[PDB]
Design a protein around this ligand. Structure first.
Ligand SMILES: *[C@@H]1O[C@H](CO)[C@@H](O[C@@H]2O[C@H](CO)[C@@H](O[C@@H]3O[C@H](CO)[C@@H](O)[C@H](O[C@H]4O[C@H](CO)[C@@H](O)[C@H](O)[C@@H]4O)[C@@H]3O)[C@H](O)[C@H]2NC(C)=O)[C@H](O)[C@H]1NC(C)=O
Ligand SMILES: *[C@@H]1O[C@H](CO)[C@@H](O[C@@H]2O[C@H](CO)[C@@H](O[C@@H]3O[C@H](CO)[C@@H](O)[C@H](O[C@H]4O[C@H](CO)[C@@H](O)[C@H](O)[C@@H]4O)[C@@H]3O)[C@H](O)[C@H]2NC(C)=O)[C@H](O)[C@H]1NC(C)=O
Ligand SMILES: *[C@@H]1O[C@H](CO)[C@@H](O[C@@H]2O[C@H](CO)[C@@H](O)[C@H](O)[C@H]2NC(C)=O)[C@H](O)[C@H]1NC(C)=O
Ligand SMILES: *[C@@H]1O[C@H](CO)[C@@H](O[C@@H]2O[C@H](CO)[C@@H](O)[C@H](O)[C@H]2NC(C)=O)[C@H](O)[C@H]1NC(C)=O
Ligand SMILES: *[C@@H]1O[C@H](CO)[C@@H](O[C@@H]2O[C@H](CO)[C@@H](O)[C@H](O)[C@H]2NC(C)=O)[C@H](O)[C@H]1NC(C)=O
Ligand SMILES: *[C@@H]1O[C@H](CO)[C@@H](O[C@@H]2O[C@H](CO)[C@@H](O)[C@H](O)[C@H]2NC(C)=O)[C@H](O)[C@H]1NC(C)=O
Ligand SMILES: CCC(CC)O[C@@H]1C=C(C(=O)O)C[C@H](N)[C@H]1NC(C)=O
Ligand SMILES: CCC(CC)O[C@@H]1C=C(C(=O)O)C[C@H](N)[C@H]1NC(C)=O
Ligand SMILES: CCC(CC)O[C@@H]1C=C(C(=O)O)C[C@H](N)[C@H]1NC(C)=O
Ligand SMILES: CCC(CC)O[C@@H]1C=C(C(=O)O)C[C@H](N)[C@H]1NC(C)=O
Ligand SMILES: *[C@@H]1O[C@H](CO)[C@@H](O)[C@H](O)[C@H]1NC(C)=O
Ligand SMILES: *[C@@H]1O[C@H](CO)[C@@H](O)[C@H](O)[C@H]1NC(C)=O
Ligand SMILES: *[C@@H]1O[C@H](CO)[C@@H](O)[C@H](O)[C@H]1NC(C)=O
Ligand SMILES: *[C@@H]1O[C@H](CO)[C@@H](O)[C@H](O)[C@H]1NC(C)=O
Ligand SMILES: *[C@@H]1O[C@H](CO)[C@@H](O)[C@H](O)[C@H]1NC(C)=O
Ligand SMILES: *[C@@H]1O[C@H](CO)[C@@H](O)[C@H](O)[C@H]1NC(C)=O
Ligand SMILES: [Ca+2]
Ligand SMILES: [Ca+2]
Ligand SMILES: [Ca+2]
Ligand SMILES: [Ca+2]
Ligand SMILES: [Ca+2]
Ligand SMILES: [Ca+2]
Ligand SMILES: [Ca+2]
Ligand SMILES: [Ca+2]
Ligand SMILES: [Ca+2]
Lengths: 387, 387, 387, 387
């Protein structure tokens, strides 16, 4: 085993090739599939895994009742191989958690699982399944983290956590973790910014995170930093607005776009100089559809012009959260860090007339070979028997 | 790990010994078994696996409705150990796919999964589960492939894909793939031929494929080629016609036999000089029954005489697709490439009054020791509870 | 890996310590557990496995209907770790089979699976899952074999097969198999003997088999042989009669005991000079109960006196088949071959009012430390929902 | 593989970080989950496992009827990875048992499973799954053991067993076991003490056990000993009484506290010089709630003062047994033996109106970093469909 270097650049990509689809909700109509939300993908040097927050319940069973609820003592972070349904019969137990992150440094898995009360939650860090550190809420108001993979460079892994209001100014911290132990942290000085649910990836030995402003931004905030946690902050400038909800596309801002700014959805983007690959919902108002857009000046420029759009999920179909994941050269044999992404396809409450909420997933990897747009939706027929 | 050499000849065989039977449909009446079609077997130097195209659904569940439909965004290529039922609890996720192939080069698995819209489908190639290439539709008319194993010689693996009409002239391409990357391709110049769903195997460092003419041939077309993709084409000459439907046996042709030539079924045959081992249905008109026939001059000669017939599935029982698979010396310890075959046993629509279509499988390997004919049919009692 | 020597003597034992219990039928009331009969245990240098003949159906499903029937094209030889229920989700596929044997030579598993028609059945031999030989019926009347483990000494494994009537004189052959290939066979010259379903074990480089006389013997026949297949034959002389059905105990015979001789049950015994450890049902008329009896002169002496009885299953509870299995020094670290046994606990038809027949199992290993009698029955409550 | 040294001291700990939660009962409402009680955790140098006593039945099936009953021939010791539900599809079979212990010496697992009749029960010892010893009841009155992990130092593992009344003086024995063989034992001379269900851990090459007085003590008895089995005995002195039932806290005793002393619950404590970490129920009278208390003089001092309390399960929620488990340096990389604990959350009879009794579990590990109190209860909604 060798630590992931993390020192190559992100691979340039022209489009997105489909990588996985689990069909979890369709399969759970009969099979024994966990009720889950907040899935994400992360890879080791040998395999990729889907992590997810269970609700300690199975689909089509009465204990799925009320699973719109975000935080409970029953939620657990578990993982299974990519593309398989999350069952009790194929899932590794990771941590007790209602908010999470995970990443592999080339040697072992780091998992971060937050549980406990809203006023005093505690993140439990594990390295190779052994508890190695904890960090407690510093603002006493729902300590919470990425819901996607952390990022690793040369034996150090990095994450972001938030504590404070989800509808006003909060507090945001960056962490450097080695072998599951926090070795450095800093509080971001980000007045008038809001960071939730960061999608962070490594690129040329530095970390870039694209997040969710739940307070007053319909474009996405970003934070980038080096191994010593020297950081920069901004908002994606493109008028191709990335959040949901959002306005119709128009001239953007390099600060928070107030129009339709409150609320949000976890997402991601990939920076390539001045340009950006944006994944977003197709609907401006609801978690419906998904598309990939290449805007060659959208990181730093405010116009609403773009060059390429690739369809992923059709506008009338359910989508949900999305997040980055990477494939390092140690896994692929390539000379660059490959960007990939996943989409959560949320079924049930609040939009559908069920007792439960759960998701399935799809994922894609960036290539420079030919690709095509389509719709790969969840495909379950609701309601279910239990509803 | 060492590349398969693929340089020995096919083992001579006098009969077919039963190797596996999964009983999937029987077991799926209660257990959590995928709705599948287009199964196939392929081996590594250590094990054999069943690959298959799921429908993103389980047997005896409502989401199995409409599974006569061939292409959807829910279909996935997955695999499980040979002889086990395909379940979410024992199946490896391979690719998102409504047409597929796979093969092991001695080092890692190559999978090929085609998804996307009919007018612009994309094959995603993976090597050890990592995307290594893509190829897009070149005729914009259902890019499609073998539905059985590709063939590997000395670190290069080979497949055939078709694009264009299934009821007229189409376009057929041969590919050479190394570590999941396309390194050579050629378009077969085959006016008046039709190639679908090729069953391809290695034999003395060259590849032989026996395929399905869906346009106007009731005998099977073949294509053989070396590593440089220098190819030859023809049709199996025997009057023991190989396709389904077909006429009653009579004097054959080394070109397409027009009588009952439209439509077809995936199949295979094994060439031994002038001779041929033909696997075919027992019914001339329907996907019923299965048998193996040794015709010692049937590759190159048009008579309707043969020497051996071995019963596999009775004429009153449902059959389906069939395909070759091989066991190389690196797996068996033999001095020759062993020929084997599988049969898909299709249940449900259109022949039976169900909401769904699914298959089970049986397989056999060639031996020079004593064998026997019998019928090993699917055995499920239809309809099911869901119907 | 090293071949099992097989040259030590059987360990002397004073009693039987409980080793496993699977509770398969109780668990299959809800879970996905195969309908099985003819289970047996066999060990490698690293683990022990339960082998069994499925009916290609699950408990409590309609396809379990009619499973009193012995031979069908749906039956398969599968295996799982000892003590686990046989499910599609934990079982390795071995062979298509309605009669079987298996054993590990220290390097790889040999499996023998007989399928095909009653008049022409064929045993398929596999070594490490690859077909290595076949043998066809020589009398055209249900070729059949042990339904328990074969026996291995120094790289050679040994079995017995029968072909011919189960109610009159038949033909019995001994086989020596190396790396899955038959290298020698002999027909036993056993006029007036009847051998079915032999339980064979190694002891000081020679094989001893204790079998079932279905024709006219209520004591058990035996055959012992060396590596060159030089054999001896006899019947267990004890008046503690071993078969079921049988008479009440009384003076025995060193030939077949005619009283209640027709029919039978598979069983076993362990020879220790003139003495014998006999496992038998408690009922003289039905497959009910089970007990272990130490008769210090019962191999060669005809009295009905014995020294020790250990209860295993109570007289009012269902039992079934039983068989030997051993644990070699390569597995245990001991200086002798440890004797063990299993019992099949048959539920359903013919004795119970169900549509199905299936079994669970228990097993024990011989020790020289303290032990105790009890009853470890199946414990399912019949009928089931499907009945 | 190397023997665990067991020569470092217990790690000092300021609080308890949540490690696992299985949600078994919730999941078993639909999935195939064993009815279990008497779970426990134990670790190797590579992983931690949950061991448990099944009832040979699944939740929400008829065979779960009557599972308030403690001892039957259907109960089996099995194990699964920590945090996963105990299912037939993920559980290793260990032993036939209605009382058990297990522990890993660094090389292989030792399991101890007691079965047989109440008047003559036999413990079967296995090492790497092979029977290595037995010990029979010496008082003919329910030979029984820890229901939690045994303790290993330098290749010797240690346990305690009891035989005789649970409501009066009984007989208690300590065992030293090497490679699954009993090499030493001694009968504890403990007139007027009562020891049941010991929770034993290693600490500086010696073993400390904290147990249950079911006769006449509401504080917990302890026994400590070196590798030669030279032992000391006493009761935890603290007026923070550890058993359930118990009185309200008040001045304690270093002998058995008679008030509310009959009956009990399995538990544990960790000694740190004069101090103690006590895990106990929150209710004085019922198996409800759970908490950890640090009493810095509570091992040797009788006051009812303590310094820290951490909430684990709320007073209105069901709890159950609890026990210690450790993580050795060979697993963690630490310089001390880490203390952890599990809690069984009992559902069903006698407190709830069901046909069955079963449990789920939670576990925590000791840390010197920040922690928080909460309630992590079972969460199933009873009764179930079967009731
Ligand atoms: C998922 O959770 C939902 C929400 O709890 C649940 O639906 C609810 O089911 C309950 C039980 O059927 C309903 O509660 C009843 O409502 C009626 C009508 O208002 C009341 O009269 C009932 O109270 C009487 O009966 C009780 C029991 O005898 C007495 O204790 C009480 O004093 C009254 O006499 C009772 O409250 C409730 O109306 C529904 N709610 C909705 C929106 O449907 C659903 O069943 C759960 N699903 C699963 C699978 O668990
Ligand atoms: C397991 O297998 C058993 C045995 O087959 C099966 O029980 C049988 O079920 C069938 C279907 O219910 C029964 O067959 C019927 O018997 C009646 C009474 O004799 C006949 O009148 C019926 O025939 C009429 O109806 C048919 C259908 O419309 C017509 O085709 C026919 O011409 C007649 O009009 C029919 O034969 C049979 O009686 C039982 N047998 C027993 C012993 O119960 C059982 O249901 C199977 N269980 C499972 C779970 O699969
Ligand atoms: C088939 O390919 C094998 C594997 O490469 C050939 O065997 C090798 O031959 C070369 C050149 O003569 C030797 O240097 C190697 O030592 C051989 N390797 C092994 C593992 O045997 C073989 O000659 C080829 N052809 C046939 C028909 O066997
Ligand atoms: C199988 O699928 C068909 C096609 O969707 C279902 O038919 C629909 O059923 C709904 C509910 O009754 C109606 O609103 C539509 O009129 C039907 N559509 C069509 C196109 O027929 C059918 O009900 C499904 N069958 C089962 C057994 O699930
Ligand atoms: C605990 O046991 C370890 C393991 O045996 C001891 O470390 C060994 O000490 C011996 C004798 O001094 C050396 O020869 C070995 O090289 C040591 N082995 C290892 C792996 O370190 C250690 O001294 C003991 N005690 C404590 C408190 O650590
Ligand atoms: C749970 O087990 C009890 C005890 O065996 C069952 O009670 C028996 O039920 C049968 C069928 O009604 C009767 O013949 C007996 O009179 C009952 N025996 C006793 C001792 O009560 C009970 O029915 C079972 N309950 C469930 C829900 O399965
Ligand atoms: C608590 C604020 C946070 C970010 C806005 O809300 C998230 C929004 C969610 C959402 O918008 O769907 C679901 C998340 N499970 C929830 N996170 C937690 C920890 O509860
Ligand atoms: C699309 C043409 C092609 C070959 C004739 O049709 C196949 C025939 C089928 C058939 O004859 O059963 C089923 C195959 N799933 C289908 N392939 C695809 C990709 O849809
Ligand atoms: C065919 C004769 C043979 C030995 C007497 O009958 C066996 C008896 C059986 C029995 O007595 O229960 C069940 C066996 N499954 C059957 N064997 C086969 C191959 O059918
Ligand atoms: C038999 C006495 C013993 C300790 C008091 O009872 C235990 C108490 C139990 C309890 O208090 O819940 C359940 C245990 N399963 C039981 N142990 C056995 C072996 O039956
Ligand atoms: C990246 O790190 C590797 C691994 O240590 C090192 O050898 C290489 O020089 C670095 N430089 C790059 C990618 O330019
Ligand atoms: C990677 O980390 C190691 C360990 O701290 C350090 O010695 C080395 O300089 C680092 N390499 C780079 C390229 O930063
Ligand atoms: C096999 O491929 C290797 C690597 O390309 C090549 O050098 C070698 O010549 C090939 N062997 C044969 C027998 O063609
Ligand atoms: C048994 O065989 C072993 C392994 O080859 C050999 O070394 C030994 O001498 C034999 N003799 C015995 C058990 O007496
Ligand atoms: C064991 O078999 C090997 C291979 O045939 C042989 O050379 C050896 O003599 C045999 N050993 C004994 C003790 O029979
Ligand atoms: C550990 O056990 C070994 C083997 O018995 C022994 O020789 C050694 O002295 C023991 N070590 C300690 C530290 O007691
Ligand atoms: Ca089920
Ligand atoms: Ca927003
Ligand atoms: Ca732009
Ligand atoms: Ca045709
Ligand atoms: Ca011919
Ligand atoms: Ca008889
Ligand atoms: Ca005698
Ligand atoms: Ca007490
Ligand atoms: Ca105190």
């Amino acid at each position: 085993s060798v630590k992931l270097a993390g020192n190559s650049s992100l691979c340039p990509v022209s489009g997105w090739a489909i990588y996985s689809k689990d069909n979890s909700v369709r399969i759970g109509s009969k099979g024994d599939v966990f009720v889950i939300r907040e899935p994400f993908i992360s890879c080791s040097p040998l395999e990729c895994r889907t992590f997810f927050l269970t609700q300690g319940a199975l689909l089509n069973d009465k204990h799925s009742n009320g699973t719109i609820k975000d935080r409970s003592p029953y939620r657990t972070l578990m993982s299974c191989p990519i593309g398989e349904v999350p069952s009790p019969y194929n899932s590794r137990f990771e941590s007790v958690a209602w908010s999470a992150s995970a990443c592999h440094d080339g040697i072992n898995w780091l998992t971060i699982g937050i549980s406990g009360p809203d006023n005093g939650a505690v993140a439990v860090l594990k390295y190779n399944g052994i508890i190695t550190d904890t960090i407690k809420s510093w603002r006493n108001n729902v300590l919470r983290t990425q819901e996607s993979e952390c990022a690793c460079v040369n034996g150090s892994c990095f994450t972001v956590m938030t504590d404070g209001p989800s509808n006003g100014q909060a507090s945001y911290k960056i962490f450097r973790i080695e072998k599951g132990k926090i070795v450095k942290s800093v509080e971001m000085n980000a007045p008038n910014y809001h960071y939730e649910e960061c999608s962070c990836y490594p690129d040329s030995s530095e970390i870039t995170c694209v997040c969710r402003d739940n307070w007053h931004g319909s474009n996405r905030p970003w934070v980038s930093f080096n191994q010593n946690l020297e950081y920069q902050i901004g908002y994606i400038c493109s008028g191709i607005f990335g959040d949901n909800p959002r306005p119709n596309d128009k001239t953007g801002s390099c600060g928070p776009v107030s129009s339709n700014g409150a609320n949000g959805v976890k997402g991601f983007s990939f920076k390539y100089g001045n340009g950006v690959w944006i994944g977003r919902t197709k609907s401006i108002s609801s978690r419906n559809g998904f598309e990939m857009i290449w805007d060659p000046n959208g990181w730093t420029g405010t116009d609403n012009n773009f060059s390429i759009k690739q369809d992923i999920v059709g506008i009338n179909e359910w989508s949900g959260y999305s997040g980055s994941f990477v494939q390092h050269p140690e896994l692929t044999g390539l000379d660059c860090i490959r960007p990939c992404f996943w989409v959560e396809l949320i079924r049930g409450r609040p939009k559908e007339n069920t007792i439960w909420t759960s998701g399935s997933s799809i994922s894609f990897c960036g290539v420079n070979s030919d690709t095509v747009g389509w719709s790969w939706p969840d495909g379950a027929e609701l309601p279910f028997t239990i509803d």
